Amino acid sequence: IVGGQECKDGECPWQALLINEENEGFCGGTILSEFYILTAAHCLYQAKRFKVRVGDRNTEQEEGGEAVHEVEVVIKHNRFTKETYDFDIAVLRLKTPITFRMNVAPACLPERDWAESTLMTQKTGIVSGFGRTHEKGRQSTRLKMLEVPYVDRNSCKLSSSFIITQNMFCAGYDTKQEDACQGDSGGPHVTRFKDTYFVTGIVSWGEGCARKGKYGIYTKVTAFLKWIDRSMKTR
Amino acid sequence: TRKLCSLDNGDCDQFCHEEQNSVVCSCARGYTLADNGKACIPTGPYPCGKQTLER
């Protein structure tokens, strides 16, 4: 996360990490339940095989609480294409159920209506991950978070050099140098309502990081709710 | 007259879905709707969306 704050004890319990063979966290994920992890479809390319680490707050020191789980099945969105980056979503099922504990808890899924309104209506969302901190820099060793304001679709399209489909949405700053970055892909964009947090989108892509005049773009989870249910019941 | 989930989410802790004229609230899986038909009581020890910190 470029220029964000640090996630304290129990502040970002839904964050999951996708580690490859060499245990390199190439992407992130959102804990949905004991077995399911929500992630970006494109992340399924940076590794022949991977595992999901949960409870990890600092990639360096192993302060316990960290737990690796193997992926049983990988349900990727059949409509994803690198040529368009549309339908950038994928659900992962783990072989072993994730034990909830301090710093390990799922995020709540909302409903299409009351998400599109109430949630997207809010002025800011929360995003996080163990990704680059400055673009052309190191990948963070501590889990970072950042409040990213909701950007209206029109300005979003006007800023992005590429086509912003209806399965996407912008969130970030125009001038302020704060924004998700590479390695944060698949990570969660949750939104707080009163005291609960609902998954609103997942880190998809963006043009550079904290690039002035550009915004970070995410997958609009709202559009995939039924698909998520399908995949959770397995389909 | 009574209506609008716009007033203040209809006093729902979470999902609000007006039906006919009433507000009618709902709770995410893992929560149970309180008897007041507005609050959402967590069912398990670690409900979704809650920060598992020294709460």
Ligand SMILES: Cc1nc2ccccc2n1Cc1ccc2c(c1)nc(CNc1ccc(C(=N)N)cc1)n2C
């Ligand atoms: C090369 C191309 N063809 C496209 C077709 C449609 C849309 C974008 C396209 N792009 C640009 C593009 C597409 C996907 C990308 C990307 C840049 N950069 C990443 C890496 N992750 C990433 C995540 C967040 C941010 C950010 N918010 N600043 C910046 C980068 N992914 C995963």
Ligand SMILES: [Ca+2]
């Ligand atoms: Ca660690």
